[PDB]
Amino acid sequence: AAEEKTEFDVILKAAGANKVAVIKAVRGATGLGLKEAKDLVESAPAALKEGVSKDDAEALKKALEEAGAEVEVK
**Per-residue buried b or exposed e for 38-66, using 16+ beta carbons within 10 Å of the residue's own CB:** eebbeebeeebbeebeeeebeebbebbee
- Cβ count within 10 A of residue 25: 25
3-state secondary structure of 14: strand
Q: Is 69 exposed, middle or buried (0-12, 13-18, 19+ CB in 10 A)?
A: buried
Cα 22 from chain centroid (whole Å): 8
Q: Which domains does the chain have, with CATH numbers?
A: 1-74 (3.30.1390.10)
Q: In sequence order, what are the beta bridge partners of 72?
A: 11
